[PDB]
UniProtKB/Swiss-Prot annotation:
Assigned keywords, A-Z: Antibiotic resistance, Lipid A biosynthesis, Lipid biosynthesis, Lipid metabolism, Lipopolysaccharide biosynthesis, Multifunctional enzyme, NAD, Oxidoreductase, Transferase
Entire protein: shown range: 315 to 656 of 660
Active site per the UniProt annotation: E120, E297
Phylogenetic lineage: Bacteria, Pseudomonadati, Pseudomonadota, Gammaproteobacteria, Enterobacterales
Protein's UniProt name: Bifunctional polymyxin resistance protein ArnA
Region span, Dehydrogenase ArnADH: 1-334
Species for this entry: Escherichia coli (strain K12)
Length: 334
């Protein structure tokens, strides 16, 4: 069986991916993290092995697990907008420098790396559909520090591409577009995965604070149910016919497009009709705020079509209802 090393397994993607791989009987999962509360259900599974670790502290212990395994999925990164500007240097050191160390262990021991790039690399790209192979990448002047995350991730993609081109690194990059479903990552957990925007909104409803609409909340986004997203990630790991080698693949549902405002209204509506609504405060309402932005973020999914024979199935309403439902029933009221 194939050994899958998941760095930063204690969260949204690690939970769903692990459940997926373990349902099949030809995988061995090694989940590395500093905690295990998010995947405790798997600690006793015969084919899951928790590994104590931190990519900023451990060097050797991680290198060892890269040599021991077959496929590597590094999910540790700080991807919360306020941080790009609040603690830029840490975002850079963790997201760029520490992950570069892991990319290098992979080329050194000739292992396969499945790397989470980001939908933010496209920046202010004018294409209606962001294309992994044709769209230009657009960011603002260096005096707009918000772009440091975007560019750091883009540079890593290029370094990976160079290793694959000059040193035989076998890799696949994937770019998730607002994945959502049960077991969302904490708003400030340094793990790549769940949509921060929908997480923030649900928190607004749960805590009784207002839903802020930056300049009207007109910017559009696409949302993907984790059942669809993880199926695609799963197929990248399978890599049938080796079709994913050297590929960059957007993973999103371009049909589930909505403005921040409409998404807010959809969650509210689903929220108002929920059986546990009374355990939460009254809706505080929509606050129009006004403070560099991205006005649209829709993916082209031709590569996912080609390399994975994948098409997203769950409609917007289903994703919304299920994500909110699991969240509300999981909250500790006391």
């Amino acid at each position: 069986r194939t050994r899958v090393l998941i760095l930063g397994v204690n969260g949204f993607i690690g939970n769903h991916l692990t459940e997926r791989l373990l349902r099949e009987d030809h995988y061995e999962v090694y989940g590395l993290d500093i905690g295990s509360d998010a995947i405790s259900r798997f600690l006793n599974h015969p084919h899951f092995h928790f590994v104590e670790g931190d990519i900023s502290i451990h060097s050797e212990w991680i290198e060892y697990h890269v040599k021991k395994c077959d496929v590597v999925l590094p999910l540790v990164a700080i991807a919360t907008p306020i941080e790009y500007t609040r603690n830029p240097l840490r975002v850079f050191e963790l997201d760029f420098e520490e992950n570069l160390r892991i990319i290098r262990y992979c080329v050194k021991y000739r292992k396969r790396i499945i790397f989470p790039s980001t939908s933010e690399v496209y920046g202010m790209c004018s294409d209606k559909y962001f294309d992994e192979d044709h769209s230009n990448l657009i960011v603002g002047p260096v005096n707009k520090p918000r772009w440091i995350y975007s560019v750091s991730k883009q540079l890593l993609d290029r370094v990976i591409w160079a290793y694959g081109e000059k040193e035989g690194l076998q890799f696949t990059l994937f770019r998730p577009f607002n994945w959502m479903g049960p077991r969302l990552d904490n708003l400030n957990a340094a793990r790549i995965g769940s949509s921060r925007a929908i997480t923030q909104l649900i928190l607004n409803l749960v805590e009784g604070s207002p839903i802020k609409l930056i300049d009207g909340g007109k910017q559009k986004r696409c949302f993907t149910d984790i059942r669809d997203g993880i199926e695609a990630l799963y197929r990248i790991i399978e890599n049938a016919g080796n079709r994913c080698d050297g590929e960059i693949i957007n993973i999103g549902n371009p049909e589930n497009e909505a403005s921040i405002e409409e998404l807010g209204e959809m969650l509210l509506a689903s929220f108002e009709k929920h059986p546990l609504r009374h355990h939460f405060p009254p809706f505080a309402g929509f606050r129009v705020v006004e403070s560099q932005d991205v006005e649209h973020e829709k993916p082209s999914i031709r590569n996912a079509h080609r390399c994975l024979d994948w098409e997203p199935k769950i409609d917007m309403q289903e994703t919304i209802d299920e994500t909110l439902d699991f969240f509300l029933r999981t909250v500790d009221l006391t």
